[PDB]
């Protein structure tokens, strides 16, 4: 019957009906009766509206302001916005349901209905449905009957006659094909939309292949599931299950846990991006020279403050490197500094000549050229990249000394916090005094110096990498501090030469060369300096308590690399402070609730309360709240500096062991299932990282002291 509708009605009416039905996911191919009904309704509405105009005088005219406005045949949103605009302008009532026409002359909405059954029944149905005595109703019938509301047929007799003649013509044409019976009988259920969604074709075959082994069709599986009832299936299957499948609890007694097994190999070496405890800084007091603020100017002044430079020579060579290249790099840095000092207006940034020594040290032209596989299919000696595991290393004693130094109290302030708003609330005053204590404790910690050094170095490195990508830049390592006398001091630790930084991925590494001053002889702990090449660059006259002593001053030179992620997280190293303070405050708070008073002053000044924070040959050692704060700050700083997957894995897998030990200490009768597996997982993360190995040793000591 669809072809009949296509050949009967106008193309615009047909396409409007198709759109209206498809708006609700109805297919005109299978819903032919509804298709014809909607087509007839649209045709009737259009005939009703057309050939009726309004003259400028304001009277209906038939041949400009159209007499009627169509609302049927539009989108739901389009029709509703048209209705809303009409209601807002003319002020008529808003119909509860979408009408079909609007009459401007009569100024009211009209519903037009076409039916195959008796007119009166449908009129009663519609009147009950709308239930509003403001929207006109007009019902036509294919038999030639018409009815309206209050017998008010707004349309002229001629137009209604045309509508009736058209309806009769459609009726006769449909009856000629014997399609009228279904059309008339289907009107009852034309207002219900039946959702259809069927699985056929390739999808049906896929469904038949996605069932348990003993099923051949989706329908069979559905039938089995629908009639399924539970009769001891789980119980019987459990009874059949072998008893070797179990979760046997093994008690975690005070003698069960064993120390972690650290790896074996050559001692681990320093891998920090800069020296921590062996760093030496040349400082200028109260910098007030012209151009203060520019790193290069301060670096030049700091270098000028020192006399005693000698001829550099190799003291501790780099085993795998070309030491003459490092020596030439240092000499070139000195020459470039001299040249820049010779000029009057020193530039903001200085690029370095791309000499052979810098080309080698920065790894220029070391990557094999990348080529598409399409153009290299004829290459015969292609081999896959290496993915060897890291080489194990043993735990060295220098990392513990580094941490001990990081936890110490310094003489100079290292951070100058910005001001905040005035305190008004009493809690704000308490917080202010507590923060005074915390800032005093934390601003004089070596870990704070490391934080500032790393933040500045990473910021400068990223700025140079992004601003200058194809140039070798010189980046002095600068820091600012306030001495015990309250006078500003600017310190230079060394220099960094940045290589090409065409960084595309977040893990792409820019190589750089770091040269740092130091007073530490590399020959005392050579294993710590495997990556470094250490020169003897000067003789320094230091003032001791009794007199003055001359000592060698070395330059630790090495090649390192850093990525965008590493620099990003290096910049956000001040967050470490929070990680400590938030803990410390919490501890204090935990006690205050017990004592119903603030214990900050007692904890910091009287030092009445102490926590076990260290180990000595005597045994466990206790420190005050300030020592604990500094220790936690140093731990956070070292986590930031020595971050690696090993550390993350070890922390995650050792938290569980710590919690089990705590449960044992709480007399909660802890129990495990595969404790050996947990130990293996923990030990899998100890390979070469000095920080992770130190943490593992700390955990072993804690186990020893907590088991007893």
């Amino acid at each position: 019957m669809e072809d009949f509708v296509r050949q009967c009605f106008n193309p615009m009416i047909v396409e409007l009906a198709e759109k209206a039905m498809k708006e609700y996911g109805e297919d005109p191919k299978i819903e032919t009766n509804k298709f014809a009904s909607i087509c007839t309704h649209l045709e009737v509405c259009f005939m009703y509206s057309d050939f009726h105009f309004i003259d400028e005088r304001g009277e209906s005219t038939i041949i400009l302001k159209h007499r009627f406005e169509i609302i049927e045949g539009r989108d739901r949103t389009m029709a509703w916005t048209v209705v809303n605009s009409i209601c807002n302008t003319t002020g008529v009532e808003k119909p509860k349901f979408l009408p079909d026409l609007y009459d401007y002359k009569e100024n009211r909405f009209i519903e037009i209905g076409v039916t195959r059954r008796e007119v009166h029944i449908y009129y009663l149905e519609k009147a009950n449905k709308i239930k509003s005595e403001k929207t006109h109703i007009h019902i036509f019938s294919f038999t030639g009957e018409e009815m309206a509301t209050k017998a008010d047929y707004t349309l002229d007799e001629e137009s209604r006659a045309r509508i009736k003649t058209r309806l009769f013509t459609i009726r006769q044409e449909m009856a000629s094909r014997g399609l009228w019976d279904s059309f008339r009988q289907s009107e009852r259920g034309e207002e219900t939309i039946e959702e259809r969604f069927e699985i056929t074709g390739t999808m049906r075959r896929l469904a038949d292949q996605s069932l348990p082994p003993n099923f051949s069709s989706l329908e069979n599986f559905r039938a089995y599931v629908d009639g399924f009832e539970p009769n001891g299936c789980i119980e019987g299957k459990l009874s059949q299950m072998s008893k070797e499948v179990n979760a046997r609890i093994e008690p975690f007694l005070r003698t069960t846990p064993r120390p972690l097994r650290l790896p074996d190999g050559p001692p681990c070496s320093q891998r920090s991006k800069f020296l921590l405890m062996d760093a030496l800084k040349l400082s200028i007091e109260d910098p007030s020279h012209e151009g203060e603020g520019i790193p290069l100017y301060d670096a030049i002044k700091c270098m000028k403050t020192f006399f005693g430079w000698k001829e550099p020579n190799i003291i501790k060579p780099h085993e795998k490197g070309i030491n003459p290249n490092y020596l030439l790099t240092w000499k070139q840095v000195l020459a470039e500094l001299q040249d820049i000092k010779n000029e009057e207006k020193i530039p903001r940034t200085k690029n370095m000549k791309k000499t052979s020594q810098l080309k080698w040290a920065l790894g220029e032209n070391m990557a094999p050229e990348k080529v598409d596989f399409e153009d290299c299919k004829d290459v015969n000696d292609l081999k896959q990249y290496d993915s060897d595991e890291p080489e194990p290393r043993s735990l060295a004693c220098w990392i513990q000394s580094e941490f001990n130094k990081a936890c110490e109290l310094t003489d100079s302030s290292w951070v100058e916090l910005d001001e905040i708003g005035e305190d008004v609330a009493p809690i704000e005053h308490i917080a202010s005094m507590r923060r005074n204590y915390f800032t005093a404790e934390v601003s004089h910690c070596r870990a704070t110096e490391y934080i500032m050094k790393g933040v500045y170095i990473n910021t400068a490195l990223l700025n140079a990498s992004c601003a200058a990508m194809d140039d070798f830049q010189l980046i002095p390592m600068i820091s600012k501090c306030i001495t015990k006398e309250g006078r500003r001091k600017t310190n230079l630790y060394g220099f960094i030469i940045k290589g090409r930084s065409h960084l595309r991925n977040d893990t792409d590494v820019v190589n750089f060369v770091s040269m740092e001053f130091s007073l530490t002889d590399p020959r005392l702990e050579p294993h710590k300096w495997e990556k470094y090449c250490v020169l003897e660059i000067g003789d320094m006259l230091l003032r001791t308590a009794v007199g003055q002593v001359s000592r060698p001053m070395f330059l630790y030179v090495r090649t390192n690399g850093t990525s965008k992620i590493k620099m990003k997280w290096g910049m956000e190293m001040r967050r470490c402070l929070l990680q400590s303070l938030q803990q410390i405050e919490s501890m204090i708070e935990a006690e205050s609730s017990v004592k119903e008073k603030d214990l900050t002053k007692e904890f910091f000044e009287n030092k009445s309360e102490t926590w076990p924070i260290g180990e000595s040959p005597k045994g466990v050692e206790e420190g005050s709240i300030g020592k604990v704060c500094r220790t936690l700050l140093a731990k956070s700083v070292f986590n930031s500096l020595y971050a690696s997957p090993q550390l993350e894995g070890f922390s995650a897998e050792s938290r569980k062991l710590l919690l089990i030990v705590q449960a044992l200490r709480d007399n909660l009768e802890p129990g495990t299932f595969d404790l050996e597996g947990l130990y293996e997982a923990i030990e899998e993360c100890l390979i070469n990282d000095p920080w992770v190995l130190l943490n593992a040793s700390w955990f072993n000591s804690f186990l020893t002291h907590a088991l007893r």
């Binding site: 405890m277 006399f307 110490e408 109290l409 003032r543 001791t544």
Partner: peptide
């Protein structure tokens, strides 16, 4: 007003500061 102090701080054992010494003549 509050000056941090540590019992582990030796006033004489660190004869000189190896990280931040005085070298001006």
């Amino acid at each position: 007003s509050y000056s941090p102090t540590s019992p582990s701080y030796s006033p004489t054992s660190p004869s000189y500061s190896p990280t931040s010494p005085s070298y001006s003549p």
